[PDB]
């Protein structure tokens, strides 16, 4: 069979972030870890063990979302969420995003993949 | 009936957040909401109905501690301060000293007494 493409092209402004930015998971009121996003152009969220983050909810689709990060001007962050047309949603703050289309997330709001359970923070 | 006045002075860096920052409140894995936090200069939280933020668990003080955000000049300067609270007030995984500004970065984890209750600084 033909060798499947990557699930994500990393679109022509996306590049490294250079500031100090996480990602803290949290599981169901109880504050887990945090992830650096230092030196991340993207992050790959899904099911399969080949993503950045691997989750395994099975609610959460094998490819799920991406979070992107917008090309650093010479020198407020840009960070894109981006849905990869999962099954059961990708959610920010409250609200389920478009499949396929870039969401700003802003410092400190919430993306939750489906029905997992954990809760990412994007924090400065 | 009503309560006496809380025990807080606003400092003199103190001032008011003009961008528009938020408080996201958690419970149990679920977003409750959240409370904007423009043209305040700090929030007061506590179990007092006249708290900007009324928390009914039991452990939570009367006047438990406040969100002071520093005055904007010509990262946003936002810091907890704890009003001597019996059962604590908890930033990140730690609980913090009594009546002594913490910073509170953009995201960060606030959580009073034994409340399940978790607020998060959002931009």
Redesign the interface.
């Known amino acids: 069979s033909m060798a499947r493409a990557p699930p994500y092209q990393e679109p022509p402004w996306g590049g490294p972030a250079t500031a100090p930015y996480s990602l803290?998971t949290?599981?169901?009121?109880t504050?887990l870890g945090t992830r650096s996003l230092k030196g991340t152009s993207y992050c790959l969220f899904g099911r399969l063990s080949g993503c950045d983050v691997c989750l395994e909810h099975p609610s959460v689709s094998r490819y799920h979302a991406v979070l992107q990060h917008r090309a650093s001007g010479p020198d407020?962050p840009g960070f894109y969420l981006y849905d990869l047309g999962s099954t059961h949603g990708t959610f920010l703050?409250?609200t389920r995003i478009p499949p396929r289309t870039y969401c700003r997330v802003?410092?400190?709001?919430?993306v939750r993949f489906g029905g997992s359970?954990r809760?990412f923070?994007?924090?400065?």
């Open positions: 803290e949290l599981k169901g009121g504050i407020g703050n409250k802003h410092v400190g709001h919430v359970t809760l923070i994007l924090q400065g």
